[PDB]
Design a protein around this ligand. Sequence first.
Ligand SMILES: CC(=O)N[C@@H]1[C@@H](O)[C@H](O[C@H]2O[C@H](CO)[C@@H](O[C@@H]3O[C@H](CO)[C@@H](O[C@@H]4O[C@H](CO)[C@@H](O[C@@H]5O[C@H](CO)[C@@H](O)[C@H](O)[C@H]5NC(C)=O)[C@H](O)[C@H]4NC(C)=O)[C@H](O)[C@H]3NC(C)=O)[C@H](O)[C@H]2NC(C)=O)[C@@H](CO)O[C@H]1O
Ligand SMILES: *[C@@H]1O[C@H](CO)[C@@H](O[C@H]2O[C@H](CO)[C@@H](O[C@H]3O[C@H](CO)[C@@H](O[C@H]4O[C@H](CO)[C@@H](O)[C@H](O)[C@@H]4O)[C@H](O)[C@@H]3O)[C@H](O)[C@H]2NC(C)=O)[C@H](O)[C@H]1NC(C)=O
Length: 361
Amino acid sequence: YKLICYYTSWSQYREGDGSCFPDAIDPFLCTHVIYSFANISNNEIDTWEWNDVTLYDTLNTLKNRNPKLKTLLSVGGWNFGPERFSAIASKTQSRRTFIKSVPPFLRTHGFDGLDLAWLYPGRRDKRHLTTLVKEMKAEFIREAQAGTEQLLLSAAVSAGKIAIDRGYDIAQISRHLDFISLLTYDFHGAWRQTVGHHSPLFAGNEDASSRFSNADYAVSYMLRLGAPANKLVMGIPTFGRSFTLASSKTDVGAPVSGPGVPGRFTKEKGILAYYEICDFLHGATTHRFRDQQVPYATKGNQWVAYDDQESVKNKARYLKNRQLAGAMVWALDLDDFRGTFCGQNLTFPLTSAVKDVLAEV
Ligand SMILES: CC(=O)N[C@@H]1[C@@H](O)[C@H](O[C@H]2O[C@H](CO)[C@@H](O[C@@H]3O[C@H](CO)[C@@H](O[C@@H]4O[C@H](CO)[C@@H](O[C@@H]5O[C@H](CO)[C@@H](O)[C@H](O)[C@H]5NC(C)=O)[C@H](O)[C@H]4NC(C)=O)[C@H](O)[C@H]3NC(C)=O)[C@H](O)[C@H]2NC(C)=O)[C@@H](CO)O[C@H]1O
Ligand SMILES: *[C@@H]1O[C@H](CO)[C@@H](O[C@H]2O[C@H](CO)[C@@H](O[C@H]3O[C@H](CO)[C@@H](O[C@H]4O[C@H](CO)[C@@H](O)[C@H](O)[C@@H]4O)[C@H](O)[C@@H]3O)[C@H](O)[C@H]2NC(C)=O)[C@H](O)[C@H]1NC(C)=O
């Protein structure tokens, strides 16, 4: 079983305890750690933060303590214009330029692979995304001839039926990718006017109409489309999405006035780190959709949909039961990495809970 963990560049700037650097990572926690995100300049891969080469170095030293640890660099991300990916993938010339620039980059900084995070390919991109993957892999293969270990190629993919149908040729890109991370966590949220969980596991006979928004559906579908189970990794979030209630109504259906107030360390409307949620829980009412098997909390006019250890071990058992390749976690820096906010003195409670289930029968 694989455990893919994302580490984000910008978590270094969070004030106080919120600050997270590569060395705060347990080298034996995950099997693969992915650094987010790399840029693209003059159609070539390139750094993003001013100190990436240093953090790159810090991250890859973890492999000195755990030789089995594999690390990857992710390109794209959400603050990256998908139009930009588009312009690069459709011009065979600039596509080849980008592809050629990748191996030496990874090789220099010590990464074991590249992770593509194009969010998201439209209908006019499907044909090229397949091309990019095809050719990118082809290149990694030819580069393994120099006698070094072959680089890995993975991709983060949407879990929205409509999004999948629109820009992904799953049967094709699965032959070439080493593994596929299913973004099974941004199903609600997305500026809606009602309250709802972003990463529910099951549909649950309650409130149907968007019957395709849950991990179970998204998974069964990918399988039906042609992705092999031993190549799928299911995404488990470590953050919650928040909402500012517009009434004293707290149950399913309750109206929303907008996103929730910012976390004290994450400072971003709409999301809270798990550790900020651990703090948010004191004096809040806790509930759990038994249908979808995920919790939510409320306190004042704040409503929070999140994942605790129980819902996470639950998701882990699920992917095991369907014989998936493993779990993907977004992100290490949003979990309680210091392990001083959530009670039980345990570093990385969420990610660990997942690792434990994966380590069992
Ligand atoms: C599987 C997968 O692919 N992952 C998906 C994710 O992409 C999804 O969302 C996530 O992605 C976006 C980015 O794509 C991320 O956005 C980040 O937003 C924060 C603000 O909330 C940005 O924070 C600001 O970052 C800049 C630099 O990065 C900091 O600027 C620096 O400032 C200091 C002094 O303060 C200087 O010393 C530096 O020189 C300076 N300038 C720079 C740019 O170098 C700034 O301090 C910081 N502060 C502020 C104003 O808040 C951050 O940059 C954004 N990321 C990027 C790459 O730009 C978003 O937060 C994240 N979402 C979550 C909740 O994690 C993810 C969503 O769930 O799911 C997957 O699908
Ligand atoms: C990620 O990679 C992006 C795409 O490669 C980077 O995009 C930016 O690149 C340029 C240069 O940084 C931005 O410059 C704009 O403003 C300057 C004035 O401040 C204008 O002058 C430039 O023009 C010439 C190029 O002919 C240079 O010789 C000169 O030195 C100067 O840079 C320039 O014309 C332009 O208007 C540009 O706006 C922007 N392009 C895009 C599409 O993003 C980006 O910087 C990278 N991001 C990070 C964080 O690394």
